[PDB]
Symmetry: D2
Subunit: 208 residues, 4 copies
Amino acid sequence: MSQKEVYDAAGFGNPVSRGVHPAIIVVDFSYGFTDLQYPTASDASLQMSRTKEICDLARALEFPVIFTTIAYHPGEIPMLPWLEKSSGMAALLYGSRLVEIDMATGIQPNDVVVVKKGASSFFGSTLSSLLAGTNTDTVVVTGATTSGCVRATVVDAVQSGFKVLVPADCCADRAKGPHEASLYDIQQKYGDVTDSDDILKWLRSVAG
Amino acid sequence: MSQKEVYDAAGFGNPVSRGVHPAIIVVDFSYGFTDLQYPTASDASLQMSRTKEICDLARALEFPVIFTTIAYHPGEIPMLPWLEKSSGMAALLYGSRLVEIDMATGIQPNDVVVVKKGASSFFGSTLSSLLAGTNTDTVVVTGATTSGCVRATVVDAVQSGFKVLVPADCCADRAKGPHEASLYDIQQKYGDVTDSDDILKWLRSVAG
Amino acid sequence: MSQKEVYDAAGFGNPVSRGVHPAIIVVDFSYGFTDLQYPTASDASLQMSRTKEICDLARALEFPVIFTTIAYHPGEIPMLPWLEKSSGMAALLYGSRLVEIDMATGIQPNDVVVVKKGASSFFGSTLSSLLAGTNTDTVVVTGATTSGCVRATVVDAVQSGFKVLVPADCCADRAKGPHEASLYDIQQKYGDVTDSDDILKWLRSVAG
Amino acid sequence: MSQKEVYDAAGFGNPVSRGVHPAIIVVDFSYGFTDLQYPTASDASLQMSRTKEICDLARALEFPVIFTTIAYHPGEIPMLPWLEKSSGMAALLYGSRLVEIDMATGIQPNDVVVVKKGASSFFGSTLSSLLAGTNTDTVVVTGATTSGCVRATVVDAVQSGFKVLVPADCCADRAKGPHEASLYDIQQKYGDVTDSDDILKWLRSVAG
C-alpha cells in the first residue's frame, strides 16, 4: 500500500462538517515572530494581510476574534524547560516590542489578547473557557509558525471539542519543509486545511 | 541564510541538561496501533523490544513507567470532533482487544495505564499529576505514532514542566516522512532526540 | 455591614440566565460513596432518586447525561498526594464494587462514565471536551459529596465556561455543616442553588 | 456516630509528610481584594504582614515565590460565566490599581506574577508548569479569600500533584463562617492547616 492508501484505510483525512458559531484564533503574530529584525521572526507579510481580512469580517459579524502572544516575566525563564530547548523565546519579555501584536494584523483595542508560555494557545491559558463561554463550535486558526505554535494550537483545539479550519495562506513558518509537514498532519488527523477565500465566503454564509 | 542557520539564530536545537528523576512514558503501544490486523496499526516490532529494555531497567530502578492508551465508550464517539477527522480511532472501544497494551512491551500487572481520548497523553488525563506527584524532572517518551500521539505527548511534556528525551528507535509511525518531520521539530523545539542505547546508559548513570 | 450586605456590595449572588443546551453531571454516585457498608459512604438514597428523575428526563430529551467515578490502579496510589490526606479514597480500585455507579441512579448502558483521580469532575479528565463537543452551555450538577467532589466540579464547570445549576436535594454529604457551607459559597459565587422540581420543569421548558 | 468519627473512619485528616522543595503561592493579595475602598476587598492587614515574612525567607532561600492576580480585558467580560454570578469581579481590569499586587506583601520586582481569570490559581494558567519546572513538591498557600480563590487553589494544588500547607493566619476572608468552613474542608481533605510560625521554622529546617 502507498502512504495515501495507508492513511485512507486508517480512517484519516475526512472532511469537517462545519458548525454555525465560528471564532478566529490568531496565533503569535507578534513582532517577535513577524519583524525580521528579531532572530525568532519569519516573513509573515502576506499571511497577516489575509488574516486581517478574515478578522475584519469575523469582527464585523460579531464572531469572537482572539489574538495570542508568548510573553515572559524574567523570573519565569529559568522555571520553564521549553526555554532550555527553544532559548530564542527568552527574548519575549513583558514590556518589550517583541510581545506586541503586529499592527499589520489590524488588531483593534476591543480585541482580546491571551498571553501564554508555551506553543499551544490552549495550554495554561484561558482560551478554552472563552470559546466555551461564547458557545463556539468551529475555530479558524492562523498565525506563526505553522510547525510550532499553530500546529500545537490546532491539536489542542480539536482535543478541546472544537472543529478546526486552517487557511494555509494565513500560516507563516521559517522553512517550507516543516510548514508542509504540519499542514499534512493537520489535514489527515486534526482539521481541514483550506484558504482565506474559502473562510471568507464561509463566514458570510453562516451569518446569512 | 540556510534553514540550519535560521534555526540556530532563532535559538533552537539546544541540548537538554538532564535531571535526576526519570520517568518513562509509553504512548499507545496498544494492539490497535501495533497489530497489523487493524488498519490503524504500524509495524512496531523492533520499537516495542527496545522500549521493553528501557522499561525493564526503569522499573528495576523504581522510576515511574507509565503506559497510555486511547479508549472510548460508544456514547463519547459523537461528542468528540477528533473522531470526525480521524474516524479510524472510533474502533478503539473499551472492552476490545484494540485498547489493550501489547505484551511485547513487557508491561507488568502493576504498571500504571492512563486512558485518554485524544493525541497527547497529558490532555484530559491524570498524567501531569502522576509525574509531579513523583517529583519527576525528565521524561523518556516512546510509542506510536511519532507524528501523532508521540509528538503531541512530547509538546505537552515540555509545556507541563518536564525535560524530554525521545529515543527514535522506540518510536513507530505508518510513514517515513511524518516520522522524520516530527523528529526534526522535536529536536529543534521540544526535546532531545536520541536512541535507546543512550537512554539505558543514562538511566544507570543517574542510578549510580 | 452585615455579611449579607458585604456579599451584596461585592457583587455576589446574581442569578444565572440559563442557556438552551443542558447537560447533567452526576458526580461520584458510586457504591463507595453511597453504600454505607463502605467507610467513605453517605446516605444518598433520596438524592439518587431525585437525580434519577432528572437523568431520565434529560436522557429522553437527548441532552447529555454524564456520570463520574473515582477509580485508581494500585500503582497510582503512592503517586497522588491527595490520597495522603484523604486515605480512604485508596479503597476505590478498578475492578472493585466501590467504583461501580450505584444502580439507584438508574444509569443505563448508553450513559458515558468518566473516570477521574481527584475531586473535580473536570480535573485531569475528558469532561470539558465532551461538553464543548456537544455545544453544552448549562450544566446541572448532582452527586456526592456536596463539600467535596460536587463543589469542586461546580467551581470547575463555571471556570470552564459553563453556566451552573445545583439541585440541593440531589447533593449528598457526610454532615450538614460542610453541606450548607458549600451550597452557600456556590449560590454566592459559582452557580444557582435550586431543587429538582425546578430542574425538571426547566428541562421540559427548553425542549418545548 | 459523630461527625469526627465519620471523617476519621472515612480516612480524612491525615498529616502531610512534607517535602524538601517548597514554593510559596500568594493568592490574589491585589488591591482589589485588600484595599477597603473597593467593595470586593477584605481586611488583610495582618495576613499580608505574616505572608511577607514567609515570602522574604523563601526568596532568600531561593524557593519559588509566586503571586497571583485576577485581571480582565473588557472583551473577556461577556465571555466568562463566572462574571455573571460574581459580577463584582468585572472591576478587576488590566491597567487598573485593583489588579496590582499590594506592596504590603513585600513583593519584589522579579517575583513572578500569574494572571488568571477564575478562582483557582492553577486553572487556565501557567502555575502547574512553573512548579513542576522547579521540581517543587510542597506548596504553602496564602491569600484572599479563604473560601474562594484560596480554597480553589488548594484543591488544584493537591490534584496537580503537590503537597499543600495552609497557614491560617495568612488567609483573609470577608466573613468568619466561610473562612472556617473552608479551613475545615482543607484540613480534612486537601492539605495541612497550620500557622506562619510553623512555616517559618519548617522552611529553615529544610534549608538546614
